[PDB]
Specification:
0% strand, binds protoporphyrin IX containing FE, 7 helices, mainly alpha, 72% helix, Globin-like, oxygen carrier activity, globular
């Protein structure tokens, strides 16, 4: 698939707003993911013991991981589809070390969309959401293909 420059513009415009508060958006997205799909929290050995949203908001480790996650995603989106080099180490660790199924990448995409819709309504109208969804589908398609080459493809 290929996004048009106009679609990338819509994606990078709202992303510029997300970058004004990287740690806060990282926390919001992880919490949304963990509340909606509790099974995903089991993948994080460091903090899978957290029981409530209050504990999640208070976790320094969760916040740190949120920033690491968002910074990596931001670097990929800024490549505008030319993310082959960035995808390699990411695909290898999530398939072989962490064992993250493609379905979990769909769940986090949903959480990213929920959070941007709540925090940035004016810059996240129907067209902008369509463009963000297209960018995330592209990322998922490419990483799934990479998983397959690596021997995981789940
Ligand atoms: C847009 C998708 C994602 C991006 C860009 C991303 C990015 C990262 C980055 C950069 C790291 C640290 C380096 C590494 O281990 O590769 C990481 C670690 C990890 N990620 Fe992700 N990730 C994504 C999705 C997920 C999802 C959906 C899950 C789980 C349900 C997950 C679970 C983990 C785990 C368990 C680690 C290890 C954390 C630790 O070191 O304690 N990732 N991810």
């Amino acid at each position: 698939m290929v996004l048009s420059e106009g679609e990338w513009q819509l994606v990078l415009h709202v992303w510029a707003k997300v970058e004004a508060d990287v740690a806060g958006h990282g926390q919001d997205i992880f919490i949304r993911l963990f509340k909606s799909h509790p099974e995903t929290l089991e993948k994080f050995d460091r903090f899978k013991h957290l029981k409530t949203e209050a504990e999640m908001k208070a976790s320094e480790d969760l916040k740190k991981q949120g920033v690491t996650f968002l910074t990596a995603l931001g670097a990929i989106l800024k490549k505008k589809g030319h993310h082959e080099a960035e995808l390699k180490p990411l695909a290898q660790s999530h398939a072989t070390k962490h064992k993250i199924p493609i379905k979990y990448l769909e769940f986090i995409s949903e959480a990213i969309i929920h959070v941007l819709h709540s925090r940035h309504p004016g810059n996240f109208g129907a067209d902008a959401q369509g463009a963000m969804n297209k960018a995330l589908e592209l990322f998922r398609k490419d990483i799934a293909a990479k998983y397959k080459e690596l021997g995981y493809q789940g």
